[PDB]
Amino acid sequence: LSLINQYKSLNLSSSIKHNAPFINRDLYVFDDLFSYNLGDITTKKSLFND
Amino acid sequence: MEPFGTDERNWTHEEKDIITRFLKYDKHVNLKTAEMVYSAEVESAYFGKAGALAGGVISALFFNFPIVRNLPIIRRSVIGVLPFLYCYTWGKNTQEELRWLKTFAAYQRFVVYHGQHCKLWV
Amino acid sequence: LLLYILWLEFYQFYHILSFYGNINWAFDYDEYIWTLELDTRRTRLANNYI
Amino acid sequence: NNLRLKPWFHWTDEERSHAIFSAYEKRILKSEDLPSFLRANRINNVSTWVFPLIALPLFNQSIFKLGFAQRILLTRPAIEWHCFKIATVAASWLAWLNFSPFYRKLENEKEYLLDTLESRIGINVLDLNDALPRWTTSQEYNRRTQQLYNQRNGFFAGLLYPQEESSRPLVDIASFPKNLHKEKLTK
Amino acid sequence: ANFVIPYLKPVADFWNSLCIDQHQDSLFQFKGQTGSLGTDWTSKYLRSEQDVYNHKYLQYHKRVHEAPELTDVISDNVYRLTLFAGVERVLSVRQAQAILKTQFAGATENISGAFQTVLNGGIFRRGYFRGALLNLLQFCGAPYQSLIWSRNSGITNQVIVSSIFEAFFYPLDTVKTLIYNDVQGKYKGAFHCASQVVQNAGWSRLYAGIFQKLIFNSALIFHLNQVWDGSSQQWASLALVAAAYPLLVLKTRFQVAGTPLALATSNEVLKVNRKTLYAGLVPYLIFNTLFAYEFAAWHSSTAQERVIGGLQNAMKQFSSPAAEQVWSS
Amino acid sequence: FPFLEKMKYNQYKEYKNDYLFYLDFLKKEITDDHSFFWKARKVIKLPQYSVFSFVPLK
Amino acid sequence: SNVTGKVALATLGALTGYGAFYHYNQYLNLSARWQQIQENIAKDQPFDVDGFDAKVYPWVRENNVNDWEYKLVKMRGYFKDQRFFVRRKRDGKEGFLVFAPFVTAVERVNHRLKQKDLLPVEYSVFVNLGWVPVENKKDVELGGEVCPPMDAPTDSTLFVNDTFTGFNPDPANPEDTEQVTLTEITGIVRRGEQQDILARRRNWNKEGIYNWVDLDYMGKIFRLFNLDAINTAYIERVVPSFEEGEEGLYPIPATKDTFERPLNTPERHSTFFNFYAATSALSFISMLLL
Ligand SMILES: CCCCCCCCCCCCCCCCCC(=O)OC[C@H](COP(=O)([O-])OCC(O)COP(=O)([O-])OC[C@@H](COC(=O)CCCCCCCCCCCCCCCCC)OC(=O)CCCCCCCCCCCCCCCCC)OC(=O)CCCCCCCCCCCCCCCCC
Ligand SMILES: CCCCCCCCCCCCCCCCCC(=O)OC[C@H](COP(=O)([O-])OCC(O)COP(=O)([O-])OC[C@@H](COC(=O)CCCCCCCCCCCCCCCCC)OC(=O)CCCCCCCCCCCCCCCCC)OC(=O)CCCCCCCCCCCCCCCCC
Ligand SMILES: CCCCCCCCCCCCCCCCCC(=O)OC[C@H](COP(=O)([O-])OCC(O)COP(=O)([O-])OC[C@@H](COC(=O)CCCCCCCCCCCCCCCCC)OC(=O)CCCCCCCCCCCCCCCCC)OC(=O)CCCCCCCCCCCCCCCCC
Ligand SMILES: CCCCCCCCCCCCCCCCCC(=O)OC[C@H](COP(=O)([O-])OCC[N+](C)(C)C)OC(=O)CCCCCCCCCCCCCCCCC
DSSP, X not given: OTTTTOOOOOOHHHHHHHHSSSOOXXXXXXXXXXXXXXXXXXXXXXXXXX | OOOOSTTSOOOOHHHHHHHHHHHHHOSSSOHHHHHHHHHHHHHHXXXXXXXXXXXXXXXXXXXXXXXXXXXXXXXXXXHHHHHHHHHHHHHHHHHHHHHHHHHHHHHHHXXXXXXXXXXXXX | OHHHHHHHHHHHHHHHHHHTSEEEEEEETXXXXXXXXXXXXXXXXXXXXX | OTTSOOTTTXXXXXXXHHHHHHHHHHTSSOGGGHHHHHHHHHHHHHHHHHHHHHHHHHIIIIITXXXXXXXXXXXXXXXXXXXXXXXXXXXXXXXXXXXXHHHHHHHHHHHHHHXXXXXXXXXXXXXXXXXXXXXXXXXXXHHHHHHHHHHHHSTTTXXXXXXXXXXXXXXXXXXXXXXXXXXXXXX | OOSSHHHHHHHHHHHHHXXXXXXXXXXXXXXXOSSOTTXXXXXXXXXXXXXXXXXXXXXXXXXXXXXXXXXXXXXXXXXXXXXXXXXXXXXXXXXXXXXXXXXXXXXXSSHHHHHHHHHTTOSSTTSTTTTHHHHHHHHHHHHHHHHHHTTTOOHHHHHHHHHHHHHHTHHHHHHHHHHHHOOSOOOSSHHHHHHHHHHHSOGGGGGTTHHHHHHHXXXXXXXXXXXXHTOTTHHHHHHHHHHHHHHHHHHXXXXXXSSTTBSSOHHHXXXXXXXXXXXXXXXXXXXXXXXXXXXXXXXXXXXXXXXXXXXXXXXXXXXXXXXXXXXXX | OTTTOOGGGHHHHHHTTXXXXXXXXXXXXOSSTTOOOOOOSXXXXXXXXXXXXXXXXX | OHHHHHHHHHHHHHHHHHHHHHXXXXXXXXXXXXXXXXXXXXXXXXXXXXXXXXXXXXXXXXXXXXXXXXXXXXXXXXXXXXXXEEEEEETTEEEEEEEEEEEEEEEOXXXXXXXXXXXXXXXXXXXXXXXXESTTXXXXXXXXXXXXXXXXXXXXXXXXOOTTTOOOOOTTXXXXXXXXXXXXXXXXXXXXXXXXXXXXXXXXXXXXXXXSOOHHHHHHHHTOSOHHHHHHOEEEEBOOOOOSOOXXXXXXXXXXXXXXXOSSOHHHHHHHHHHHHHHHHHHHXXXXXX
């Protein structure tokens, strides 16, 4: 009864992309924008900001 | 935590509803007071329908009572339905009285717990 | 009328005599359960005398 | 184990029949063990209700033609003769009720069922007994057992009457909550 | 305990079930927890206080988004069919009273006279409840089948389906009217009345006033939809059905004519005093307004929105009136 | 006193009203159901027997 | 009584004909719906219920059980020990459908972690583990291994409590209270049944006899918090055809071609229509002869 038309947004990622003050993340430039000397990455690694 | 005296205004229905809702769903009230209010509600809900059902049965009998049956419909219906009205009002009154008395006891307990009475202290 | 007054007196007398039995629900959080507890009553002696 | 006192050595016929019925309704005892007991009970009822009918002609042919019977018939009023006949017939019927071979067979079958229950549920068979209501007799309990058997084996075993098979949830008693507390009263 | 309590326990249990919340009692019956918080008594009462309205909403949704159920429809219309089933007979008698013989049998030509005529036979099969089974069957039939075959449909489609089903089941309505207006007990039952009608007059005798019945049914369906929607034009629709009421009274007169129960025949029914063409209008309107048909299946979008909004407004009372506005949630 | 004790059979009270799990309860292990056991009131050293009876003579 | 007999026979024939027409239309509609459902299942396009959906299932959220019924759903979580048995026949063999709670989400609402180990709030849904014969019901083990736990995720950043579900997929969580094992299941969401005396579906709660699934009663007895979601609908686990006897594993999980069928079936409706048509034809023939 209380759930009637209460959650009209489900994909939080879409809203974050559309409203956050950041450059578009769909640009293909980031694939080879810079060059780095890294290797031996046998497992997925994530970058933490700051 | 409210005016006292003959000249003061008795509790209104809206005030009672607000106070009972506050006692039920407020965070400053204690678990014992909340349980008292809940027990009041659950144990008082019965009379409201018990009185109505008893009144319905009694009115059904009175409609066929020896004189009511032979009386004309104009007054027969009223005479037969009067017991239903009496029982319904009795049930509603007793339900409200029990619920409000226990809610007022809970309110007193809350007032003593939070020291909001000008002449109550340990 | 005598029957009515008798019922009223009996109801008040029953309330007064039931006062001394202090029954209260206690909620134990470890089991999350309400249990009845019986205890004595402490009150001003004037109330007991009346 | 002749010298061993069984848990139900003191139980009466009513208590034994009530225990059998309670076990069957609680499904401790399956429907496959009833038919012999039911047949024995029906035979016992038939014999009990038919004994006087067969006995009275025999008494007329042999006992009532004896010397003392003829003396009573001839030298005393017809009322007293009828009273004597009724009294002797009643005494014979009571003796039959006490020492009927069919009654003994029914008791033996009940004993077999009680032994099966004891083997199945250990000493807890005593827990199947309760304060039986007064005036409810062993015949009544046997009738109730037969009625439950017929209801469970009839066409309405799942439409109008509960099914014999048990669908109780599978839980652990050592951890599942209980409806009653040992000393206090729960809400 | 062995001869009274076993027979008295069911009555007390039924009384308690009627006078107590079954869902709340069931929730409180199960005590303890299996490993999840919120199974305590305090939470269950809090949950049930909202589950009342939640169950109301769920039942309404089921009556709308699921196939209609005869038990649900009867529960919705219990008052109109269970306790006040003699008002239908009294209204029919009042409508047909112009061409009946009751005015010569200690009854006036008014609603009070119709009530007295109905009650002179008592409360049972020959009195107040006469024809109650026929009315219940007709309701469990034509309206129920119409709901089944026109669930969630527009006004036009609903009217068409209801008209078709009323035409199909019309003879039952005629037999019910004859049983209602049989004051001297000429007919022993519905089958006997139908057999007598067929034997005396042709099968067409059972289809008298079908067109006016269908027109009045269409008007009543329109009024029901308007009142369910709640628009202010519900009063205009009430006036329209009041104006169409003479169609209903003519239908009843035609059904009750051409028989020993009436003083007039089919030809004479048309040429009856026009001053009695609104016999029972106010009683009929009052009865229908107080005990209207609660056909949730035919409720339109506006009615569903109204019901949901009312339920939400009722649900909005479960917050603390003195809740403090906190900077941090 | 042990005969007067009623908490021994308290476990059966729940199932006397709730039959749903009565079969599961009966499927438990029998330790002291409808039985009395008196602990050794005298010191006894007899390797032949692993348990001794101390039930009242009467 | 010739007229009375004729009238009664005509009424019976008319009612029977209307019933036959209604049953025929219902049979056609049900056959079309069943064919569409079979095609949808064969398409093999399941929906993964994870994230916020795991805590608030979409069908419960939008009250769209009608639209979501007969849809393949992939869920993740841990089962509860308790099991529920409902009498039912599969392939003409007597047996019991087995239902188990499946905790799809967990919420922790205790801030005094170091003082009290408050129990969490578990949001769960009933899932049908399969069907077992009556004689083999005792073979079902409490808290049995339904499906092997899903392999731990390769990503290291996923070893945290999910913002929505709250689960931690770490095989060996450093916090004992946070430890939990997750398993993946695939099933079909099914609508809860209802009492039906005519269909021989009667439940005796006190005697522990169940013939129709009562989600509300099951949730109440198992003491589950997510009672409304449980009552909304339940899932029927579906596994690819194993094509083996699997001795010992008596509870047979449902398959796309052998999942439990609804009470209302095209075969039943066709049988009812045939009976009504035969009765109406007999009545009409009798009327014509008379
Ligand atoms: C938990 C449940 C507990 C239930 C408890 C039941 C206890 C029963 C006790 C019976 C024994 C004592 C009866 C004493 C009666 C009064 C004696 C007296 O002085 O009167 C003299 C009086 C004559 O007076 P008079 O001055 O010499 O002359 C007056 C003139 O004759 C001119 O006449 P008059 O105009 O003056 O008429 C006077 C009349 C006028 O007053 C009334 O009209 C009475 C109105 C109140 C009726 C109350 C009924 C009982 C209470 C309710 C029962 C449960 C209902 C549940 C419904 C559930 C629905 C879902 O008042 C009476 O006399 C009172 C009784 C009249 C009865 C009339 C017929 C009733 C029919 C309906 C009930 C039976 C249906 C059976 C159907 C077939 C079988 C299934 O004669 C009588 O009328 C006596 C009748 C005695 C026999 C009554 C038998 C009743 C049986 C009821 C069984 C239980 C219900 C079963 C229901 C089953 C279906 C659901
Ligand atoms: C708590 C109060 C309410 C209690 C209600 C009762 C509850 C009882 C318990 C429940 C169960 C039982 C159910 C009821 C059983 C029967 C009760 C009974 O005896 O009552 C009948 C009883 C009459 O029985 P009777 O003794 O047989 O009548 C004497 C004659 O036999 C009459 O013979 P007749 O039938 O042949 O009459 C001929 C006909 C004459 O034929 C006509 O109709 C004449 C037509 C002339 C032509 C007009 C059209 C012209 C052309 C069209 C022009 C415009 C359109 C142009 C279009 C152009 C394009 C095409 O007469 C009339 O139409 C007028 C009759 C009197 C009307 C009285 C209205 C009272 C209003 C009350 C105040 C206002 C409403 C307040 C509501 C709220 C209260 C809180 O009624 C009363 O006397 C008053 C009853 C209480 C009135 C309640 C008001 C109605 C409430 C419900 C409806 C909603 C409101 C409607 C008005 C407002 C709309 C905005
Ligand atoms: C509750 C748990 C269960 C709930 C289940 C669900 C409820 C709904 C179920 C509905 C369906 C049930 C199943 C079907 C049953 C069918 C029975 C049957 O055969 O009846 C038929 C019916 C039987 O006729 P009959 O028996 O000779 O006479 C009827 C009597 O007059 C009788 O009518 P009456 O109005 O004069 O009755 C007066 C009324 C006076 O009493 C009352 O009104 C008291 C009750 C008032 C309302 C409730 C108050 C609160 C509860 C009180 C409970 C008290 C105890 C009740 C005990 C009842 C019996 C167990 O009751 C009585 O005194 C009855 C008299 C006893 C003999 C007849 C009835 C047998 C028992 C049936 C019981 C059914 C009850 C169902 C509902 C139960 C609700 C609780 O015949 C017709 O309707 C014939 C119609 C012919 C029309 C013309 C056809 C011409 C040809 C045209 C063909 C079509 C067109 C062709 C094509 C053309 C080209 C397109
Ligand atoms: C239905 C319509 C038909 C007519 C009905 C007329 C009334 C019929 C009354 C029958 C006799 C009742 C005697 C009850 C005695 C026991 C009362 C008791 O113990 O109280 C319990 C219950 C009360 O229980 P309680 O504990 O809730 O009491 C509440 C107490 N107060 C009000 C202070 C809050 O009694 C009642 O409900 C009311 C009893 C009123 C008794 C009045 C007696 C003096 C007046 C006599 C009037 C005579 C009228 C004559 C006829 C006139 C007709 C027009």
